[PDB]
Amino acid sequence: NAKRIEGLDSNVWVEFTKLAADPSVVNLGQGFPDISPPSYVKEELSKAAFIDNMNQYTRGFGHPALVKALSCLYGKIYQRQIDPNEEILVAVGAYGSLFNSIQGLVDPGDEVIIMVPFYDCYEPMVRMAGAVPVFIPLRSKPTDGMKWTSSDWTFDPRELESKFSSKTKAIILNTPHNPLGKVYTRQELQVIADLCVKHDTLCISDEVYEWLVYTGHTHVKIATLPGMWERTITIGSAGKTFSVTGWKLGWSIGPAHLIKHLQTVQQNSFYTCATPLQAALAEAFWIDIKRMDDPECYFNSLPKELEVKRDRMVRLLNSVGLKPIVPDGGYFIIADVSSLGADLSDMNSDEPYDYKFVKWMTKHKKLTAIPVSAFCDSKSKPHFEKLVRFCFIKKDSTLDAAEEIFRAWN
Amino acid sequence: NAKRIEGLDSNVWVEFTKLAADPSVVNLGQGFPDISPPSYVKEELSKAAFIDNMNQYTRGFGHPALVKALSCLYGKIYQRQIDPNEEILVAVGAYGSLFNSIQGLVDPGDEVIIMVPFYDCYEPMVRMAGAVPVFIPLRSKPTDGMKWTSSDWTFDPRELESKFSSKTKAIILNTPHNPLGKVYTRQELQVIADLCVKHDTLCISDEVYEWLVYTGHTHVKIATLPGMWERTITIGSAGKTFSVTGWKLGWSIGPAHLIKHLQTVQQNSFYTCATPLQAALAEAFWIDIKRMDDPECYFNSLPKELEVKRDRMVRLLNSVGLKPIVPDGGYFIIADVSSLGADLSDMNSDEPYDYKFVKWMTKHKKLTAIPVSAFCDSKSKPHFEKLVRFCFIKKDSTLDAAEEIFRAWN
Ligand SMILES: [Ca+2]
Ligand SMILES: [Ca+2]
Ligand SMILES: [Ca+2]
Ligand SMILES: [Ca+2]
C-alpha cells in the first residue's frame, strides 16, 4: 500500500453494520432516515431518468441547473451574490467536499485544528494530506437545572488560542455538530473568526445540518462574519437537506481563489458527478426555494417534524435512566450511560466502555446505537467513553418498536 | 494551493466545449452518446427512485446487489470465483477507479509507464501522486496496402523493456484504446505480462470499452494471463457499458491484497456511491447477463449497431480525403488531415497543427473533432499533431447531418 494511507484502513463501522443486520433489532445507530423522502424529490429523479441528455455527462464542477439553484438559494442566505461557476463546486456528497477542501488546501507538515468529538473522517483526511491534526475537546458547563442540553457544551477560548501557531493552516468547524447536536453561537463563531484573521488561516465549515436547528436556536454561518468570506469554505449536502442520503451530492461554497484549488482536486479524481441526480436535485431545490417563507417548505417542515421525535426520544431515554443531552440541532441525541448498571467486566477486551455497552445492549435489549468514542482521537476517548449516540430521523413505527424495548427494559 | 496540485489545473477541454457552443454545429468531438440508452436502463432508474431504501446509504464499497452482479458477470469472463466484497470496488466512474488505483498503490518517486496517445487523466493522476510518468509511444507498422487500421499501430517490445527499471511501480494499459481504437492482441498483452512478472510491477488495466470490439477482433484481459491475476487491477464503466455516461459508476476487479488498498482510498475520499444509480444498474446487468448468447443482449446488440456507424464514418472521412484509421473497437475514429488543402495562415505561432485544424473545421465546415495531440505528453505531440478524433456513437439524425457537411465540403 502507498505511504499516504498507512494506518487509515480502520473500519469499526462494518462491525456496527454487522450488529445491526439481525432483523429483530431496532437500529438507532447509523444516520439512516427511514422516513420517506419528500414525494417530489422521488418524482424528479424519475422524470430525469426518462430524458436521454440527463443520462449523459454534464458539467464537471456541477450541473448548470444545480449550481444555478444553489447560487440563488445561498445568495439569499449570505445576503451576497454567489457565483454559480466560480464560487460553487458540486462533489460526491459533503464527504467528497471535505476531501476536495483538504486535498486542495492543505500541505504536508501543516496543522489542522479539530474539535473533539468530530465527524470521524476529519482525522484520516488531514493525515492523508500529510498534515498534523491538532485536537481540542468540547467541555461541558453547569446545567440550567432542568435539562442537559447541547448548549451546555462549549470550548475554552484561551485553550483554542493555545492551539494556533505559525504552522496552523486551517480549523475544521462542524455546526450543527455531529455527534453533539451543538449549534455554535455567534459568540463562539466570533472567537474562532478572531483567531483565523489574527493568524491568517482558513476555516473549513461543515454545515450539512444547517436546516435542522430547533426552537430557540439559529444557524449562523461563520463565513458571513467580518473578514471570513475571504478565508472560509462552507459545505452543504443533498442527503441531509432532502433525507436522500443515497444520492451523495454536496457542495462547497466560498471565494474563487479557494474554490479554484478544490476544483483542481475534483478534475483530477472523479471529474464530474451523476447527471440525473443533479438534474432532479435542482428541481427539488426550485420547488423549495420558491416557498421559503411557508411551513410547507421542506427546510421548515422537517425540523418541525423532527423536533417532536427529538422530545419523544429524550423521554424514552430518561425512562431507563440514560441521561440524554437534548440537541440544539441535527438528528442525533447523545446519552450518558454510566448511571445504568455497569455490566461489562465479563466482556473481555481493552475496547472502550461504550463499544462494550453498545454490544451488550444489542445482544440483550435488541437496540443498537453508536459509541461516542468512535468520534474521538485516541487520547480523548476516555473522556467520552461513557457516551452513546442515537439517531432519531425515524418513522413513528420504528420509534414505537424502540418504545416497546424501553418499557420492557426493567 | 497544495503542492500536490501544482500546474495540474489546465483544462484545455473548456476551449473545446466553447467551440461546441453551436452556431448550428454538428458536434463530433467529446465521447457523448446521443443515442438513447437502452429503455430498461431508464426504466430501472425510475423504479428505484420510488423505493425509499433505494434513496438511502448503501454498502460503502458497492451496493450488495451490484457487486453480486459484477461478480457473476466477470466470473463467467475470468473463469473464476470472484469475491463480491473483497475483489470488487465500485467507484465514481472508471475515472474514480483509476484515481483509487493510483492513490492507493503509487508513492512519490515511483515510475508509472504510460502509452501515448493516452486517455488524458493518466498523466496528471500519476503526477498528483508525486510519481514520475514514463511515456512510450505507439508506432505504425506497414499497412496491408488496402486500408489503415488500429492494428497497424503497435509497440516495440525492446523499447518497452527499456522503460522498466526498479523504480517502475506500474504500467497503465488501455484496451480497447482511446483515442486510437486499438484492440491489443494476445501477443502484445503477453509482452506486458512478461515484463510485469520479471520486474514485480503492477498493471492497471483500463478496459471500459471491453464490449465494443468489431468483427475480426477479441477483447482479452491481461489479468487472465499466467501470473497476472495477483498483480492486475482491471477497470470497468457503467457509462460505457450501458451508454449512460452521466451515471458515473465504475469498478475495479482484482486480488484482495490490491483491492483492500483501493477500498482504503475510497473510504477516506468519497465513501459510498449513489444508491439508486447502483440499484438500477444491478438490475440492468441481470437483464443482460441472462441473455448472453442472444443478439438482444446489449453487449452484442450495441457493437453490432456501432460497426455499421463506424463503416459509415470511414466512407464519409474518405469521401473528402481525410485518411481514416479504422478502429478495432471503441467509438472513436482518428483521421489523418495532413494531405488536405492544409493551409492555415489565420492562426500564427506554433501551438499544434491539429488544434488549428479543428478550429478551422468548426468555423468553415461547422464540424468539431478532438485534436490527437491533446492525448500526448509534450515531447510526443509533434508525432501525432496531424491526427484528429471523431466520435460516432451518434443517432442517424446526427450522422445524416454529418453527410450533408462532407457532401458540401468541396
Ligand atoms: Ca501496511
Ligand atoms: Ca458576484
Ligand atoms: Ca499563519
Ligand atoms: Ca522491481
Curated annotation (Swiss-Prot), chains A, B:
Cofactor requirements of the protein: pyridoxal 5'-phosphate
Tissue and organ expression note: Widely expressed, with higher expression levels in liver, kidney, heart and neuroendocrine tissues.
Temperature dependence: Optimum temperature is 60 degrees Celsius.
Enzyme Commission designation: 2.6.1.7, 4.4.1.13, 2.6.1.63
An example Gene Ontology CC term for this record: mitochondrion
Sites bearing N6-acetyllysine, chain numbering: K76
Residues bearing the modification N6-(pyridoxal phosphate)lysine: K240
Regulation: Kynurenine transamination is competitively inhibited by cysteine, glutamine, histidine, methionine, leucine, or phenylalanine.
Pathway per the UniProt entry: Amino-acid degradation; L-kynurenine degradation; kynurenate from L-kynurenine: step 1/2
pH profile: Optimum pH is 9.
Entry binding sites for substrate: G31, N178, R389
Keyword Zinc-finger (UniProt): no
Assembly: Homodimer.
Purpose: Catalyzes the irreversible transamination of the L-tryptophan metabolite L-kynurenine to form kynurenic acid (KA), an intermediate in the tryptophan catabolic pathway which is also a broad spectrum antagonist of the three ionotropic excitatory amino acid receptors among others. May catalyze the beta-elimination of S-conjugates and Se-conjugates of L-(seleno)cysteine, resulting in the cleavage of the C-S or C-Se bond.
Family recorded in the similarity comment: Belongs to the class-I pyridoxal-phosphate-dependent aminotransferase family.
Name this protein carries in UniProt: Kynurenine--oxoglutarate transaminase 3
